[PDB]
Structures are given as C-alpha cells and as structure tokens.
Amino acid sequence: CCIXGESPGXAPXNDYKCXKGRGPGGCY
C-alpha cells in the first residue's frame, strides 16, 4: 500500500510521514 498507493512511492521522507509528500495524510 505504501502510503496507500496514492503517492509516488513509499516516500519514507518524501510523503510517508514527511511534509514533502501530501496524500491520504502522511507528513513529517
């Protein structure tokens, strides 16, 4: 699912719990 498959990818810092990425609700 990595972020739920709504972002570029796992983005362990680009979205997944990172302010860089904003999908279902993943930021820093």
mmCIF file with all atom_site columns, N, CA and C in Angstrom:
data_model
loop_
_atom_site.group_PDB
_atom_site.id
_atom_site.type_symbol
_atom_site.label_atom_id
_atom_site.label_alt_id
_atom_site.label_comp_id
_atom_site.label_asym_id
_atom_site.label_entity_id
_atom_site.label_seq_id
_atom_site.pdbx_PDB_ins_code
_atom_site.Cartn_x
_atom_site.Cartn_y
_atom_site.Cartn_z
_atom_site.occupancy
_atom_site.B_iso_or_equiv
_atom_site.pdbx_formal_charge
_atom_site.auth_seq_id
_atom_site.auth_comp_id
_atom_site.auth_asym_id
_atom_site.auth_atom_id
_atom_site.pdbx_PDB_model_num
ATOM 1  N N  . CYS A 1 1  ? 0.862  -1.216 0.000  1.00 0.00 ? 1  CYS A N  1
ATOM 2  C CA . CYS A 1 1  ? 0.000  0.000  0.000  1.00 0.00 ? 1  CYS A CA 1
ATOM 3  C C  . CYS A 1 1  ? 0.882  1.244  0.000  1.00 0.00 ? 1  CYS A C  1
ATOM 4  N N  . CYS A 1 2  ? 2.027  1.157  0.671  1.00 0.00 ? 2  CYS A N  1
ATOM 5  C CA . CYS A 1 2  ? 2.948  2.287  0.738  1.00 0.00 ? 2  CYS A CA 1
ATOM 6  C C  . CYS A 1 2  ? 2.184  3.597  0.591  1.00 0.00 ? 2  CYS A C  1
ATOM 7  N N  . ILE A 1 3  ? 1.789  4.175  1.719  1.00 0.00 ? 3  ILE A N  1
ATOM 8  C CA . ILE A 1 3  ? 1.038  5.425  1.703  1.00 0.00 ? 3  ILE A CA 1
ATOM 9  C C  . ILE A 1 3  ? -0.376 5.181  1.190  1.00 0.00 ? 3  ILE A C  1
ATOM 10 N N  . UNK A 1 4  ? -0.608 3.985  0.661  1.00 0.00 ? 4  UNK A N  1
ATOM 11 C CA . UNK A 1 4  ? -1.919 3.623  0.139  1.00 0.00 ? 4  UNK A CA 1
ATOM 12 C C  . UNK A 1 4  ? -1.908 3.638  -1.387 1.00 0.00 ? 4  UNK A C  1
ATOM 13 N N  . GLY A 1 5  ? -0.723 3.810  -1.966 1.00 0.00 ? 5  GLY A N  1
ATOM 14 C CA . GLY A 1 5  ? -0.593 3.839  -3.418 1.00 0.00 ? 5  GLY A CA 1
ATOM 15 C C  . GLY A 1 5  ? -1.166 5.132  -3.989 1.00 0.00 ? 5  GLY A C  1
ATOM 16 N N  . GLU A 1 6  ? -1.138 6.196  -3.191 1.00 0.00 ? 6  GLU A N  1
ATOM 17 C CA . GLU A 1 6  ? -1.661 7.480  -3.630 1.00 0.00 ? 6  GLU A CA 1
ATOM 18 C C  . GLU A 1 6  ? -0.523 8.464  -3.854 1.00 0.00 ? 6  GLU A C  1
ATOM 19 N N  . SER A 1 7  ? 0.686  8.046  -3.496 1.00 0.00 ? 7  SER A N  1
ATOM 20 C CA . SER A 1 7  ? 1.851  8.902  -3.663 1.00 0.00 ? 7  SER A CA 1
ATOM 21 C C  . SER A 1 7  ? 2.852  8.275  -4.627 1.00 0.00 ? 7  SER A C  1
ATOM 22 N N  . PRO A 1 8  ? 3.918  8.975  -4.917 1.00 0.00 ? 8  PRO A N  1
ATOM 23 C CA . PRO A 1 8  ? 4.981  8.483  -5.843 1.00 0.00 ? 8  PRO A CA 1
ATOM 24 C C  . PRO A 1 8  ? 5.522  7.121  -5.420 1.00 0.00 ? 8  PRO A C  1
ATOM 25 N N  . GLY A 1 9  ? 5.660  6.925  -4.111 1.00 0.00 ? 9  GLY A N  1
ATOM 26 C CA . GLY A 1 9  ? 6.167  5.664  -3.586 1.00 0.00 ? 9  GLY A CA 1
ATOM 27 C C  . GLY A 1 9  ? 6.289  5.711  -2.067 1.00 0.00 ? 9  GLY A C  1
ATOM 28 N N  . UNK A 1 10 ? 6.829  4.644  -1.488 1.00 0.00 ? 10 UNK A N  1
ATOM 29 C CA . UNK A 1 10 ? 6.997  4.577  -0.040 1.00 0.00 ? 10 UNK A CA 1
ATOM 30 C C  . UNK A 1 10 ? 7.298  5.959  0.527  1.00 0.00 ? 10 UNK A C  1
ATOM 31 N N  . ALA A 1 11 ? 8.111  6.726  -0.194 1.00 0.00 ? 11 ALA A N  1
ATOM 32 C CA . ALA A 1 11 ? 8.469  8.067  0.250  1.00 0.00 ? 11 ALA A CA 1
ATOM 33 C C  . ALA A 1 11 ? 8.662  8.093  1.763  1.00 0.00 ? 11 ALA A C  1
ATOM 34 N N  . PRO A 1 12 ? 9.668  7.415  2.245  1.00 0.00 ? 12 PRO A N  1
ATOM 35 C CA . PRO A 1 12 ? 9.982  7.356  3.706  1.00 0.00 ? 12 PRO A CA 1
ATOM 36 C C  . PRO A 1 12 ? 10.402 8.715  4.258  1.00 0.00 ? 12 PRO A C  1
ATOM 37 N N  . UNK A 1 13 ? 10.279 9.741  3.426  1.00 0.00 ? 13 UNK A N  1
ATOM 38 C CA . UNK A 1 13 ? 10.636 11.096 3.829  1.00 0.00 ? 13 UNK A CA 1
ATOM 39 C C  . UNK A 1 13 ? 10.113 12.108 2.806  1.00 0.00 ? 13 UNK A C  1
ATOM 40 N N  . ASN A 1 14 ? 9.544  11.593 1.721  1.00 0.00 ? 14 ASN A N  1
ATOM 41 C CA . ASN A 1 14 ? 9.018  12.444 0.662  1.00 0.00 ? 14 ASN A CA 1
ATOM 42 C C  . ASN A 1 14 ? 7.500  12.533 0.751  1.00 0.00 ? 14 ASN A C  1
ATOM 43 N N  . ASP A 1 15 ? 6.905  11.668 1.568  1.00 0.00 ? 15 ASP A N  1
ATOM 44 C CA . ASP A 1 15 ? 5.458  11.658 1.731  1.00 0.00 ? 15 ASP A CA 1
ATOM 45 C C  . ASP A 1 15 ? 5.061  10.858 2.965  1.00 0.00 ? 15 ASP A C  1
ATOM 46 N N  . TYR A 1 16 ? 5.490  9.600  3.009  1.00 0.00 ? 16 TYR A N  1
ATOM 47 C CA . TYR A 1 16 ? 5.173  8.735  4.139  1.00 0.00 ? 16 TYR A CA 1
ATOM 48 C C  . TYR A 1 16 ? 5.708  9.330  5.433  1.00 0.00 ? 16 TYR A C  1
ATOM 49 N N  . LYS A 1 17 ? 4.868  10.104 6.111  1.00 0.00 ? 17 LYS A N  1
ATOM 50 C CA . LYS A 1 17 ? 5.259  10.734 7.368  1.00 0.00 ? 17 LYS A CA 1
ATOM 51 C C  . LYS A 1 17 ? 6.226  11.888 7.118  1.00 0.00 ? 17 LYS A C  1
ATOM 52 N N  . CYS A 1 18 ? 6.151  12.470 5.921  1.00 0.00 ? 18 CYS A N  1
ATOM 53 C CA . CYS A 1 18 ? 7.014  13.592 5.568  1.00 0.00 ? 18 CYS A CA 1
ATOM 54 C C  . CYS A 1 18 ? 6.198  14.727 4.961  1.00 0.00 ? 18 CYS A C  1
ATOM 55 N N  . UNK A 1 19 ? 6.489  15.948 5.385  1.00 0.00 ? 19 UNK A N  1
ATOM 56 C CA . UNK A 1 19 ? 5.770  17.115 4.885  1.00 0.00 ? 19 UNK A CA 1
ATOM 57 C C  . UNK A 1 19 ? 5.987  17.290 3.386  1.00 0.00 ? 19 UNK A C  1
ATOM 58 N N  . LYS A 1 20 ? 7.014  16.635 2.859  1.00 0.00 ? 20 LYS A N  1
ATOM 59 C CA . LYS A 1 20 ? 7.320  16.735 1.435  1.00 0.00 ? 20 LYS A CA 1
ATOM 60 C C  . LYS A 1 20 ? 6.173  16.193 0.593  1.00 0.00 ? 20 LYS A C  1
ATOM 61 N N  . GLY A 1 21 ? 5.607  15.083 1.035  1.00 0.00 ? 21 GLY A N  1
ATOM 62 C CA . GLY A 1 21 ? 4.504  14.459 0.316  1.00 0.00 ? 21 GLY A CA 1
ATOM 63 C C  . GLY A 1 21 ? 3.194  14.606 1.083  1.00 0.00 ? 21 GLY A C  1
ATOM 64 N N  . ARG A 1 22 ? 2.113  14.863 0.354  1.00 0.00 ? 22 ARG A N  1
ATOM 65 C CA . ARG A 1 22 ? 0.804  15.020 0.978  1.00 0.00 ? 22 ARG A CA 1
ATOM 66 C C  . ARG A 1 22 ? -0.252 14.232 0.211  1.00 0.00 ? 22 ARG A C  1
ATOM 67 N N  . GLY A 1 23 ? -0.530 13.021 0.674  1.00 0.00 ? 23 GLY A N  1
ATOM 68 C CA . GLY A 1 23 ? -1.524 12.174 0.028  1.00 0.00 ? 23 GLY A CA 1
ATOM 69 C C  . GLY A 1 23 ? -2.736 11.978 0.933  1.00 0.00 ? 23 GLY A C  1
ATOM 70 N N  . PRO A 1 24 ? -2.902 10.792 1.453  1.00 0.00 ? 24 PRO A N  1
ATOM 71 C CA . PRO A 1 24 ? -4.039 10.458 2.358  1.00 0.00 ? 24 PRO A CA 1
ATOM 72 C C  . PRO A 1 24 ? -3.913 11.146 3.717  1.00 0.00 ? 24 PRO A C  1
ATOM 73 N N  . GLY A 1 25 ? -2.711 11.628 4.019  1.00 0.00 ? 25 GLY A N  1
ATOM 74 C CA . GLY A 1 25 ? -2.466 12.302 5.288  1.00 0.00 ? 25 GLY A CA 1
ATOM 75 C C  . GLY A 1 25 ? -1.128 11.873 5.882  1.00 0.00 ? 25 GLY A C  1
ATOM 76 N N  . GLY A 1 26 ? -0.087 11.884 5.056  1.00 0.00 ? 26 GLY A N  1
ATOM 77 C CA . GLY A 1 26 ? 1.242  11.496 5.513  1.00 0.00 ? 26 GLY A CA 1
ATOM 78 C C  . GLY A 1 26 ? 2.196  12.685 5.484  1.00 0.00 ? 26 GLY A C  1
ATOM 79 N N  . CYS A 1 27 ? 2.727  13.037 6.649  1.00 0.00 ? 27 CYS A N  1
ATOM 80 C CA . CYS A 1 27 ? 3.654  14.156 6.747  1.00 0.00 ? 27 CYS A CA 1
ATOM 81 C C  . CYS A 1 27 ? 4.623  13.935 7.903  1.00 0.00 ? 27 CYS A C  1
ATOM 82 N N  . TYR A 1 28 ? 5.733  14.676 7.894  1.00 0.00 ? 28 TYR A N  1
ATOM 83 C CA . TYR A 1 28 ? 6.742  14.570 8.948  1.00 0.00 ? 28 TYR A CA 1
ATOM 84 C C  . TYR A 1 28 ? 6.219  13.756 10.126 1.00 0.00 ? 28 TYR A C  1
#
